[PDB]
Structure 1
Protein backbone atom coordinates (compact mmCIF):
# COMPACT_ATOMS: atom_id res chain seq x y z
CA UNK A 1 0.00 0.00 0.00
CA UNK A 2 0.90 3.66 -0.02
CA UNK A 3 2.67 3.51 3.36
CA UNK A 4 6.06 2.35 2.26
CA UNK A 5 7.50 5.43 3.92
CA UNK A 6 6.99 3.60 7.17
CA UNK A 7 9.32 0.91 5.88
CA UNK A 8 11.93 3.19 4.39
CA UNK A 9 12.28 5.30 7.44
CA UNK A 10 12.42 2.20 9.58
CA UNK A 11 15.38 1.16 7.45
CA UNK A 12 17.20 4.40 8.08
CA UNK A 13 16.50 4.27 11.79
CA UNK A 14 17.62 0.75 12.34
CA UNK A 15 20.66 1.18 10.17
CA UNK A 16 22.00 4.10 12.07
CA UNK A 17 21.02 2.60 15.37
CA UNK A 18 22.80 -0.67 15.00
CA UNK A 19 25.79 1.05 13.49
CA UNK A 20 25.95 3.14 16.62
CA UNK A 21 25.48 0.10 18.80
CA UNK A 22 28.36 -1.67 17.11
CA UNK A 23 30.52 1.34 17.74
CA UNK A 24 29.50 1.28 21.39
CA UNK A 25 30.36 -2.34 21.83
CA UNK A 26 33.65 -1.70 20.08
CA UNK A 27 34.49 0.93 22.66
CA UNK A 28 33.42 -1.49 25.38
CA UNK A 29 35.81 -4.02 23.99
CA UNK A 30 38.63 -1.51 24.27
CA UNK A 31 37.69 -0.63 27.84
CA UNK A 32 37.57 -4.26 28.88
CA UNK A 33 40.89 -4.75 27.19
CA UNK A 34 42.25 -1.90 29.28
CA UNK A 35 40.94 -3.75 32.30
CA UNK A 36 42.78 -6.89 31.23
CA UNK A 37 46.04 -5.07 30.52
CA UNK A 38 45.74 -2.90 33.64
CA UNK A 39 45.87 0.52 31.94
CA UNK A 40 43.41 2.09 34.34
CA UNK A 41 44.12 5.62 33.14
CA UNK A 42 43.34 4.66 29.56
CA UNK A 43 40.25 2.87 30.76
CA UNK A 44 39.25 6.12 32.46
CA UNK A 45 39.62 8.10 29.25
CA UNK A 46 37.67 5.50 27.35
CA UNK A 47 35.07 5.54 30.06
CA UNK A 48 34.78 9.29 29.56
CA UNK A 49 34.18 8.81 25.84
CA UNK A 50 31.72 6.09 26.74
CA UNK A 51 29.98 8.60 28.90
CA UNK A 52 29.91 10.95 25.90
CA UNK A 53 28.64 8.25 23.57
CA UNK A 54 26.45 5.89 25.47
CA UNK A 55 24.26 8.47 27.12
CA UNK A 56 24.49 10.54 23.97
CA UNK A 57 22.74 7.74 22.10
CA UNK A 58 20.37 7.18 24.99
CA UNK A 59 19.42 10.82 24.67
CA UNK A 60 18.82 10.01 21.01
CA UNK A 61 16.40 7.34 22.21
CA UNK A 62 18.36 4.20 21.49
CA UNK A 63 17.74 2.91 25.01
CA UNK A 64 15.62 3.79 28.01
CA UNK A 65 18.85 4.46 29.93
CA UNK A 66 18.72 1.25 31.96
CA UNK A 67 21.42 -0.27 29.77
CA UNK A 68 23.53 2.78 30.35
CA UNK A 69 23.09 2.35 34.07
CA UNK A 70 24.02 -1.31 34.07
CA UNK A 71 26.99 -0.84 31.79
CA UNK A 72 28.50 2.28 33.31
CA UNK A 73 27.86 1.25 36.89
CA UNK A 74 29.01 -2.33 36.54
CA UNK A 75 32.07 -1.44 34.51
CA UNK A 76 33.00 1.39 36.81
CA UNK A 77 32.95 -1.17 39.59
CA UNK A 78 34.98 -3.49 37.38
CA UNK A 79 37.49 -0.69 37.01
CA UNK A 80 37.40 -0.17 40.76
CA UNK A 81 38.43 -3.81 40.91
CA UNK A 82 41.04 -3.12 38.23
Structure 2
Protein backbone atom coordinates (compact mmCIF):
# COMPACT_ATOMS: atom_id res chain seq x y z
CA UNK A 1 0.00 0.00 0.00
CA UNK A 2 0.97 3.69 0.03
CA UNK A 3 -0.99 5.46 2.77
CA UNK A 4 0.23 5.05 6.35
CA UNK A 5 -3.22 4.13 7.67
CA UNK A 6 -3.71 1.56 4.92
CA UNK A 7 -0.81 -0.60 6.10
CA UNK A 8 -2.40 -0.33 9.55
CA UNK A 9 -5.77 -1.53 8.31
CA UNK A 10 -4.42 -4.45 6.25
CA UNK A 11 -2.95 -5.88 9.45
CA UNK A 12 -6.33 -5.52 11.19
CA UNK A 13 -8.47 -6.83 8.33
CA UNK A 14 -6.63 -10.15 8.65
CA UNK A 15 -6.93 -10.31 12.44
CA UNK A 16 -10.67 -9.80 12.03
CA UNK A 17 -10.93 -12.46 9.33
CA UNK A 18 -9.26 -15.15 11.44
CA UNK A 19 -11.46 -14.11 14.36
CA UNK A 20 -14.75 -14.27 12.46
CA UNK A 21 -13.98 -17.44 10.50
CA UNK A 22 -13.47 -19.42 13.71
CA UNK A 23 -16.86 -18.25 14.99
CA UNK A 24 -18.76 -18.99 11.78
CA UNK A 25 -17.23 -22.46 11.52
CA UNK A 26 -18.28 -23.15 15.11
CA UNK A 27 -21.86 -22.40 14.08
CA UNK A 28 -21.73 -24.79 11.12
CA UNK A 29 -20.41 -27.65 13.29
CA UNK A 30 -23.13 -27.02 15.86
CA UNK A 31 -26.13 -26.74 13.55
CA UNK A 32 -24.90 -29.94 11.85
CA UNK A 33 -24.77 -31.83 15.15
CA UNK A 34 -28.39 -30.86 15.74
CA UNK A 35 -29.21 -32.19 12.27
CA UNK A 36 -27.85 -35.60 13.27
CA UNK A 37 -30.03 -35.91 16.36
CA UNK A 38 -33.06 -34.49 14.54
CA UNK A 39 -32.72 -36.90 11.60
CA UNK A 40 -32.39 -39.96 13.84
CA UNK A 41 -35.73 -39.10 15.48
CA UNK A 42 -34.05 -38.89 18.87
CA UNK A 43 -36.05 -36.12 20.70
CA UNK A 44 -33.76 -36.64 23.73
CA UNK A 45 -30.58 -34.90 22.58
CA UNK A 46 -32.52 -32.92 19.97
CA UNK A 47 -34.50 -31.17 22.70
CA UNK A 48 -31.27 -30.22 24.50
CA UNK A 49 -28.83 -29.62 21.67
CA UNK A 50 -31.34 -27.06 20.40
CA UNK A 51 -30.88 -25.19 23.68
CA UNK A 52 -27.11 -25.11 23.11
CA UNK A 53 -27.18 -24.34 19.38
CA UNK A 54 -29.49 -21.34 19.69
CA UNK A 55 -27.33 -20.07 22.54
CA UNK A 56 -24.25 -20.21 20.31
CA UNK A 57 -26.08 -18.30 17.58
CA UNK A 58 -27.09 -15.43 19.86
CA UNK A 59 -23.53 -15.14 21.14
CA UNK A 60 -22.23 -14.99 17.58
CA UNK A 61 -24.76 -12.25 16.78
CA UNK A 62 -23.79 -10.09 19.76
CA UNK A 63 -20.11 -10.30 18.76
CA UNK A 64 -20.87 -8.76 15.37
CA UNK A 65 -20.00 -11.89 13.41
CA UNK A 66 -23.46 -12.50 11.94
CA UNK A 67 -26.44 -10.19 11.77
CA UNK A 68 -29.36 -10.44 14.17
CA UNK A 69 -31.89 -11.18 11.43
CA UNK A 70 -29.64 -14.07 10.39
CA UNK A 71 -29.67 -15.53 13.90
CA UNK A 72 -33.46 -15.23 14.01
CA UNK A 73 -33.71 -17.04 10.67
CA UNK A 74 -31.60 -19.96 11.86
CA UNK A 75 -33.24 -20.37 15.26
CA UNK A 76 -36.69 -20.39 13.65
CA UNK A 77 -35.62 -23.14 11.26
CA UNK A 78 -34.04 -25.44 13.83
CA UNK A 79 -36.96 -25.06 16.23
CA UNK A 80 -39.46 -25.97 13.52
CA UNK A 81 -37.44 -29.11 12.87
CA UNK A 82 -37.83 -30.06 16.54
CA UNK A 83 -41.60 -29.58 16.66
CA UNK A 84 -42.10 -31.83 13.61
CA UNK A 85 -40.16 -34.69 15.23
Q: TM-score, structure 2 length as denominator?
A: 0.86
For structure 1, list consecutive stretches of 5 or more residues without a partner in the other structure: none
RMSD value over aligned CA atoms?
1.3
Equivalent-residue separation in structure 1 for 2:52 and 2:11 (angstroms): 31
Instruction: Kindly report which structure 2 residues correspond to 1:1-82, keeping only aligned pairs within 5 A, or say none.
Output: 1-82=4-85
**Residues 9-67 of structure 1 deviation map (CA, whole Å, 9 limit, x = unaligned):** 11111111111111111011110111111122212221111122111010001122111
Q: Secondary structure at the match of 2:18?
A: helix
Q: Which runs of 4+ in 1 moved over 2 A?
A: none
Q: Which of these two proteins has the greater Rg computed from alpha carbons?
A: 2
Q: CA deviation at 1:2?
A: 4.7
Q: 2: CA distance between counterparts of 1:47 and 1:15?
A: 27
Q: Which runs of 5+ in 2 are unaligned?
A: none
TM superposition shift of 1:77: 0.6
Aligned length: 82
